[PDB]
């Protein structure tokens, strides 16, 4: 890769079919700054603070997405319709900070080698589904053009409690479960 | 104060399928040296690219052969300019006042796994210095460390290990230095 003190990712767009799935993001030094919510047609910052000074017109993201929709049809044919190869995701779970009983912490599930960029990341607490208090980053680009994604689970440490990060993807015969314990 | 996007340019008109556009702006010593790169990707193959270092579109693979010719005849102008309206502008007017000023102080804690683990968490930016100490003396062996870990939430973490034998009365210290810190942080263990 190229060397620099800093690196900004601008205009980052992804589009695929079937399904009309598109994504537009910006990153700086490897971290997501925002993504444009295609549905609501709005800029969603990774951190609240963000869009308080600087600004981004969602219109831009929508443009690139559309252009990419255009490019996909052409290249698809050009390749004599060569499909995307389903990769197998690799998942890892680790705590944000040192674990202390009864003290609010966060489990991070890092998933890499994602391709195509369609995936189901879920959490289980004692093999019981958990939907509340869960956050998920956008699909973040890798130099090899695959993606990585992160999910977060805010929890209260306690002994014996078992946590799982469940990953589902077409390139997976069976779903993968990444376990973590207090 | 407005962020400029790096624009995707239209190709000439001639089971899952994927296409990607990557706009990249490299910076070294402020905006002293800037470099723009634009990648056009089909599935996982980059076939078309524009690079400031070159100044024009080049085919990365046989798949982009003619794409290069088209983009060069149709967009050379609009593209080269993004180096200023996108890279230079975004850096000077949007990153300087935000990301380049963000400072997160690390949290430091020592726990015992024998092996000692100094956990240095939630700091930003990535530049950090961590060293172990036994009785004011620096540890020159039995020191290992995890890779720098990106939490994905704009904070980093790193665990620095120390192999040792808890001989009574000994005093271990984890020394941590980071731009956010007024003075180094030191946590002790006995």
UniProtKB/Swiss-Prot annotation, chain A:
Q: What fragment of the full-length protein is this?
A: 28 to 205 of 256
Topology relative to the membrane: Single-pass type I membrane protein
Alphabetical UniProt keywords: Adaptive immunity, Disulfide bond, Glycoprotein, Immunity, Membrane, MHC II, Signal, Transmembrane, Transmembrane helix
Protein name (Swiss-Prot/TrEMBL): H-2 class II histocompatibility antigen, A-D alpha chain
GO annotations of cellular component type? external side of plasma membrane; lysosome; MHC class II protein complex; plasma membrane
Q: Where is the Ig-like C1-type domain?
A: 89-180
Q: Which family does it belong to?
A: Belongs to the MHC class II family.
Give the Extracellular compartment stretches of this protein: 3-180
Q: Per the record's keyword annotation, is Metal-binding included, yes or no?
A: no
Chief location category: membrane
Q: Name one GO molecular function term.
A: peptide antigen binding
Q: Name the segments for region: Alpha-2.
A: 87-180
Q: Where is this region: Alpha-1?
A: 3-86
What gene is this protein a product of?
H2-Aa
* Sugar attachment sites: 120
A biological process (GO) of this protein is: antigen processing and presentation of exogenous peptide antigen via MHC class II
**Localisation per UniProt entry:** Membrane
State the disulfide connectivity: 109-165
UniProtKB/Swiss-Prot annotation, chain B:
Tell me the domain of life: Eukaryota
Where does it localize? Cytoplasm, Cytosol; Cytoplasmic vesicle; Presynaptic cell membrane; Golgi apparatus membrane
Post-translational note:
Phosphorylated; which does not affect kinetic parameters or subcellular location. Palmitoylated; which is required for presynaptic clustering.
Regarding protein family, the annotation reads: Belongs to the group II decarboxylase family.
General function of this protein: Catalyzes the production of GABA.
Assembly description: Homodimer.
Entry protein name? Glutamate decarboxylase 2
Organism encoding this protein: Homo sapiens (Human)
Shown chain mapped onto the complete sequence: 207 to 220 of 585
């Amino acid at each position: 890769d190229i060397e620099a003190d800093h690196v900004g990712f601008y205009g980052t767009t992804v589009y695929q079919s079937p399904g009309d799935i598109g994504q537009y993001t910006h990153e700086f030094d490897g971290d997501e700054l925002f993504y444009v919510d295609l549905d609501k047609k709005k800029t969603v910052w990774r951190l609240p603070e963000f869009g308080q000074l600087i600004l981004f017109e969602p219109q831009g993201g929508l443009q690139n997405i559309a252009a990419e929709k255009h490019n996909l049809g052409i290249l698809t044919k050009r390749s004599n319709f060569t499909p995307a190869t389903n990769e197998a995701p690799q998942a890892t779970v680790f705590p944000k900070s040192p674990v202390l009983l009864g003290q609010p912490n966060t489990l991070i599930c890092f998933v890499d080698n994602i391709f195509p960029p369609v995936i189901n990341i879920t959490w289980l607490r004692n093999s019981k589904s958990v939907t509340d208090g869960v956050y998920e980053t956008s699909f973040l680009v890798n130099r090899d053009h695959s993606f990585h994604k992160l999910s977060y689970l805010t929890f209260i440490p306690s002994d014996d409690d078992i946590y799982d990060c469940k990953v589902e993807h077409w390139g997976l015969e069976e779903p993968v479960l990444k376990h973590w314990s207090s | 104060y407005e962020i400029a996007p790096v624009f995707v340019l239209l190709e000439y008109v001639t089971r899952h399928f994927v296409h990607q556009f990557k706009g990249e702006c490299y910076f070294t010593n402020g905006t002293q040296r800037i470099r723009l790169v634009t990648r056009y990707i089909y599935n996982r193959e980059e076939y078309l690219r524009f690079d400031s270092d070159v100044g024009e579109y080049r085919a990365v693979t046989e798949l982009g052969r003619h794409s290069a010719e088209y983009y060069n005849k149709q967009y050379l102008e609009r593209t080269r300019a993004e180096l200023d309206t996108a890279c230079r502008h975004n850096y000077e007017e949007t990153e300087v006042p935000t990301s380049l000023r963000r400072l997160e102080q690390p949290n430091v804690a020592i726990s015992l796994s024998n092996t000692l683990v100094c956990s240095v968490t939630d700091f930003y930016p990535a530049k950090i210095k961590v060293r172990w100490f036994r009785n004011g003396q620096e540890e020159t062996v039995g020191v290992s460390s995890t890779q720098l870990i990106r939490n994905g939430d704009w904070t980093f973490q790193v665990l620095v290990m120390l192999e040792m034998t808890p001989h009574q009365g000994e005093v271990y210290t984890c020394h941590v230095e980071h731009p956010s810190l007024k003075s180094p942080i030191t946590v002790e263990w006995s």
